[PDB]
Structure formats: C-alpha cells, structure tokens
Amino acid sequence: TNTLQVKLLSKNARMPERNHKTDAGYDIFSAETVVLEPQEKAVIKTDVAVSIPEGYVGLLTSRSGVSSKTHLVIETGKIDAGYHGNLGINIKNDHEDDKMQTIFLRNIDNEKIFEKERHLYKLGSYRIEKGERIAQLVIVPIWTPELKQVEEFESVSERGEKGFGSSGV
Amino acid sequence: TNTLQVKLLSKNARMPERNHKTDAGYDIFSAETVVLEPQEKAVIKTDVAVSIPEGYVGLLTSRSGVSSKTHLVIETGKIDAGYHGNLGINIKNDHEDDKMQTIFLRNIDNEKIFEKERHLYKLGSYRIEKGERIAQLVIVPIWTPELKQVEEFESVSERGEKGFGSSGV
Amino acid sequence: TNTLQVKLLSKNARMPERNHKTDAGYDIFSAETVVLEPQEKAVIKTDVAVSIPEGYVGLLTSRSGVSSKTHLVIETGKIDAGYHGNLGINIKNDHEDDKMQTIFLRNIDNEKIFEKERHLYKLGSYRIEKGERIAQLVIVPIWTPELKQVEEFESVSERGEKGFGSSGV
Numbered sequence A, B, C: 001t002n003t004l005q006v007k008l009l010s011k012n013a014r015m016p017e018r019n020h021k022t023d024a025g026y027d028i029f030s031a032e033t034v035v036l037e038p039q040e041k042a043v044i045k046t047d048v049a050v051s052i053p054e055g056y057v058g059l060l061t062s063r064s065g066v067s068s069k070t071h072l073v074i075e076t077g078k079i080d081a082g083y084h085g086n087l088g089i090n091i092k093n094d095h096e097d098d099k100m101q102t103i104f105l106r107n108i109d110n111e112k113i114f115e116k117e118r119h120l121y122k123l124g125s126y127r128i129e130k131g132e133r134i135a136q137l138v139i140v141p142i143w144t145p146e147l148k149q150v151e152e153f154e155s156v157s158e159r160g161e162k163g164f165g166s167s168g169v
C-alpha cells in the first residue's frame, strides 16, 4: 500500500518525478534522442519499468505544455497491472507533409534549434532530447467484474439508447 | 457488485474478453467489415450493449498494438452509467491523402492483404475485418459531486494558476 | 465531500452542467467565438476555474457528438488537484489543408453556416460559438504512492514484458 516499484533498465533511464504535492501524475523522461519527420510514427523508449498492483491501471498520457505547443501527439497508453516491460511512448508527429523544406529543427518548445552545421530538414520536423519530460503517468483504480450475458437489462434507464450528441450543442 | 450485464445485439456481435488475469480492460470485437480511406471518419458498430452501474464510467479506448502499428486513431469514448445503446467505436484513418494510388489494402497489422482480383485503392487505406479486436473497455470509478459556485476558492494552493508547461521540459 | 467549488472568471463564462442523473461528466461551455482553419491549433478559454480536492484528477475530454461529426480533436487534459487557473480546451482542427477554398464555414454540427455577406474560407474551416458545449469534465479518483526504486520486481507476473499486440488481433 502507498508504494510503487520502479525498475530502471539502463543508464539512459531517469526516475519519474511528480511536479507538485497534490499533482496527479509522474513526469516521464525520454531515454533516447529521436528526430520525427512530418506524419512519422514511433514508440519512444523510456527504459523504465513499473509494477502496478492489481485493481489499478496506469495512464501513460501526454503533458498539456508539449501537446498544445507542438504537433507531437501521444496516444494515452493503458498500463496493465503486472506489466514489467519497457514503458513505450506511443507518439506521432501529426504535422502535415506539405513537401516544403527547412534548415531548422523544432524542439518540444516549438522553437527552432540553433545549429552550426547546415542541414536540410522537412518542414514540421521535431527533435526530442534524451532526458526531456514529454509524457506523464497517472494511476487510477479500476473495476474488473465478471461479465454476465443477458437477453435484456434488468432496469430501464432515463438515458436509454441515446448518444453521440443526442442533447444540444 | 462484481457483475456487469452485457447484451449482444446481433449474430455479428461477440462477447468482450479480458487478456490476462490482472489486465485492465475487455477487448472489444468489431461487428462489421469496414474499409477506411485516408482521412475518413466513421463509427464502427460492435452490436454490444453494457449496463455500467452508477458511480462508474466506461472508457472505450484504443489498443496499443493497433494504434502504434496503424494510422487508425480511436477517440476514447466515455460510456455513461445506464447507456444501453450500441457501443460505437469513434474512429479515424489519420493517414495523409497524398493523392497516390496503390493496389493493396492494409490490415490492422499494417500488412498488405493478398487479393486475387486487381483493385485500385488510395495509398493509406485500411480494412477492418468482422470479429477483430480493435478496441478495449476499461471501467473506472467516478466522483460526481454537486457544483457550488464561489467568488473565490477557500484555500490557496501551491500550484495556483500555473499550467501548460509552467515547469521545465 | 460531495461538493466541488467552481469559480466563474467572466460574464462570458457559463456553469458546467450534467446531462443525465447517472451521467459521468459535466458539459463545458466555450467562453469565446473561435474560427479554426485546417491544421490549426489553439487553446479555447472557458473562463471557468475549479478546485479539485486531493486524491482526484479532472479529465477535460471531448464529447462523442462533436468529435465523431467534426474534424475537431481535443486532447484529454489532466486537471491537477488545486489548479485554480482558467480551464483551457487543448484543441486542433485536424482537417487536411488541401489548398482548396470554400464560401462556407462549418459549425460543430458539421453543417454549413448561412451567411449574408460573401467570404472566402479554407476548405475544412470550423467556427465555435460562445456558449456552445464542445467538451466535458469527468473526475476520477487517483493513486499517488511514493516511488521505490528496485533492482528487480518482487513477483513474476503472467503478463511479463509482453505488450503492443502480443496477443492476437
């Protein structure tokens, strides 16, 4: 109770850190330096393993700062209780490939990185540095009941079969 | 307690299944065969209805395998307690429409499906087969209090009004 | 217990509202009128502040109606306990910029808005009106333990290091 086991898989790995006392998640550091071109997909290694206890799920999800400023989209990962593998960040550079070329790379602050050597990149390309906080881990309790098949449900709800914007907008 | 009612709506429907003993969600099978072109949006029918009890929400969310390998993006659906309608998978083929043509269709393993007959498809088109696990359902408890309007909050937090990457990166 | 403090920041702000008795979230109204061109990113102000108590997280997430009908993509925001700032909707118009022009704007019902004056817009542009329900807030309890670094985990799980579609599809 009130203790989570964390296993670092390499020297490139870093221990997750909570920002404030009442904050929800633990900021996840990147273990590798990755360059992502427009519309490219990848799984960023963190070299961090956790042992979520039974009755809980981990949500490997994006940070508001990175997601709002950059075209980097992270799909929220559902970390199962007992997953002792490498926590991978399911990421996509969602910037459009307009077939235009630039001489700069973007950082996770959406700013152009200063380089001494001349290089030609695609417009919308991002670079993630090793040891940068690009994601966070929020752990929530879960309900895992036994499924019971029925002909119809025992009670009629006020909601019914209404959905997908059945109310106003 | 510890029992969830599930109602199958057709012969094309399949009962949700949990992968491991300590796993979080129940894998959701597709009830229909759908072909999705680049940048096309659809709501995939599962023909499965559930009865989430009061004080819980269902999260109809993507699987890591499908989402990381394919351009198929699923928006996490919040299933209300008492929604007895058809569970629809809010999906988009997020592949770019580069106006290029191919003779193959992709499966949910991102592999080109072998076909005897010659057909011309758009580059980035996917095909979802009936009875395939493309999504999962994770059920979490919720807090639904009565809202109280105030002039200002009763306590000052260490966080304050800071957000959107107020700390480092 | 069973009470959430809400602070309205302007006259343009509106109090969040729950749709049904057993519904999960509170519908969030937009405080500003915003026009979003293809592939444009923005943070929509709600002028609403909340005081989430310790041990809970708020999920500022999209509604199924808007997300399924429109190209408007909202990233689920994790609202920390004690965040008294303006709740911003992290949004992107994910419609492709095909360099085509139209004389109509889309509403959040994906319908073309009737206008008396002639204007030229980009194809895929959306308009969000002030006082429209574009998002919702679902509050879930969290587990925030102290992190303990270990050489290896105390128990071997049936899952192990398997992930990213290790089972079938």
Ligand SMILES: O=c1ccn([C@H]2C[C@H](O)[C@@H](COP(=O)(O)NP(=O)(O)OP(=O)(O)O)O2)c(=O)[nH]1
Residues within 6 Å of the ligand: A162, A163, A164, A165, A166, A167, A168, B060, B075, B076, B077, B078, B079, B080, B081, B083, B086, B087, B088, B089, B090, C019, C062, C063, C064, C065, C066, C136
């Ligand atoms: O992906 C989804 C999302 C929701 N749903 C169902 C479950 C939920 O009870 C219902 C409506 O969900 P939301 O309240 O989150 N969206 P919205 O507010 O637009 O619909 P409504 O106006 O009917 O509440 O639709 C799905 O079947 N699939």
Ligand SMILES: O=c1ccn([C@H]2C[C@H](O)[C@@H](COP(=O)(O)NP(=O)(O)OP(=O)(O)O)O2)c(=O)[nH]1
Residues within 6 Å of the ligand: A019, A062, A063, A064, A065, A066, A136, B162, B163, B164, B165, B166, B167, B168, C060, C075, C076, C077, C078, C079, C080, C081, C083, C086, C087, C088, C089, C090
């Ligand atoms: O969509 C959002 C997401 C977050 N927020 C607020 C709530 C939260 O308390 C705060 C920061 O959220 P995160 O910690 O998840 N993102 P980040 O770590 O980048 O910001 P910070 O560095 O300030 O913690 O911003 C919004 O208003 N809208």
Ligand SMILES: O=c1ccn([C@H]2C[C@H](O)[C@@H](COP(=O)(O)NP(=O)(O)OP(=O)(O)O)O2)c(=O)[nH]1
Residues within 6 Å of the ligand: A060, A075, A076, A077, A078, A079, A080, A081, A083, A086, A087, A088, A089, A090, B019, B062, B063, B064, B065, B066, B136, C162, C163, C164, C165, C166, C167, C168
């Ligand atoms: O972003 C992610 C998502 C999942 N994972 C891990 C944790 C989880 O226990 C495992 C599989 O998660 P899912 O069950 O949600 N996806 P899928 O059903 O496709 O994989 P599998 O078939 O192995 O269960 O992969 C990550 O490391 N990063």
Ligand SMILES: [Mg+2]
Residues within 6 Å of the ligand: A019, A027, A063, A136
């Ligand atoms: Mg943070």
Ligand SMILES: [Mg+2]
Residues within 6 Å of the ligand: B019, B027, B063, B136
């Ligand atoms: Mg799974």
Ligand SMILES: [Mg+2]
Residues within 6 Å of the ligand: C019, C027, C063, C136
């Ligand atoms: Mg709703």
Ligand code: NI
Residues within 6 Å of the ligand: A076, B076, C076
């Ligand atoms: Ni999500």
Ligand code: NI
Residues within 6 Å of the ligand: A094, B094, C094
């Ligand atoms: Ni896109």
